[PDB]
Amino acid sequence: HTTDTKVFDKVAASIFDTVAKCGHEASPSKTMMTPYSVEKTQTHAKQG
Amino acid sequence: TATREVDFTVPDVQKILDDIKALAAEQVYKIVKVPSISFRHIVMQSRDRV
Amino acid sequence: YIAPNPRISSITLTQRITTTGPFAILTGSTPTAQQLNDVRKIYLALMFPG
Amino acid sequence: NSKDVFYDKFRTEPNRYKALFRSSFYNESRRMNEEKILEAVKYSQKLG
Numbered sequence A: 001h002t003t004d005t006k007v008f009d010k011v012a013a014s015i016f017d018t019v020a021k022c023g024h025e026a027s028p029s030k031t032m033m034t035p036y037s038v039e040k041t042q043t044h045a046k047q048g
Numbered sequence B: 001t002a003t004r005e006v007d008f009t010v011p012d013v014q015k016i017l018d019d020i021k022a023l024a025a026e027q028v029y030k031i032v033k034v035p036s037i038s039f040r041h042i043v044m045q046s047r048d049r050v
Numbered sequence C: 001y002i003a004p005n006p007r008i009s010s011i012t013l014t015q016r017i018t019t020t021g022p023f024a025i026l027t028g029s030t031p032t033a034q035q036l037n038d039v040r041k042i043y044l045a046l047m048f049p050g
Numbered sequence D: 001n002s003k004d005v006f007y008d009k010f011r012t013e014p015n016r017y018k019a020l021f022r023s024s025f026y027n028e029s030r031r032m033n034e035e036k037i038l039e040a041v042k043y044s045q046k047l048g
Helices: A005-021 B013-023 C024-028 C033-047 D018-022 D024-047
Strands: A037-039 A044-046
Touching: A005 D018, A005 D024, D018 D024
Parallel strands: none
Antiparallel strands: A037 A044
């Protein structure tokens, strides 16, 4: 429900911080956060 | 032949709702310690007239 | 030459719910060169009565 | 997650998320994805 880049940056930072504080760590270079693209268990979907 | 031109037949209602919600948070006043100046004086060579 | 607004013929209520028009096959067709010439003839007849 | 899917036709529509890709997260993703390729190229040029 937003388009401002600052809000999205805050949301992404919160997600990564929450993952880090649980004892795990997620690489930001492989994390997917996008529309029009879904990938689940070696299955790729682009724009339907 | 299809997808040749962009169509706008289906409007985006979720975006409209987001816009109205963002408009709901606007502030149209301010809180100040002193009011703004409404009268100023020009000092000429006189000592008792301005 | 201006086409009518697409929203006049059909309405969408939800993402997957949409009303169907009675002349969908005709409204999707495109003219050929001869049919365009016939349309020009029709408008020429309209603009010069008698 | 429903599987009762049927498909009808193609179309083209404007993108709502057009302005959201100048954020810092996407820049970092692209930058690290470039950097890994750069290190691979450097290693290849060094070994061979």
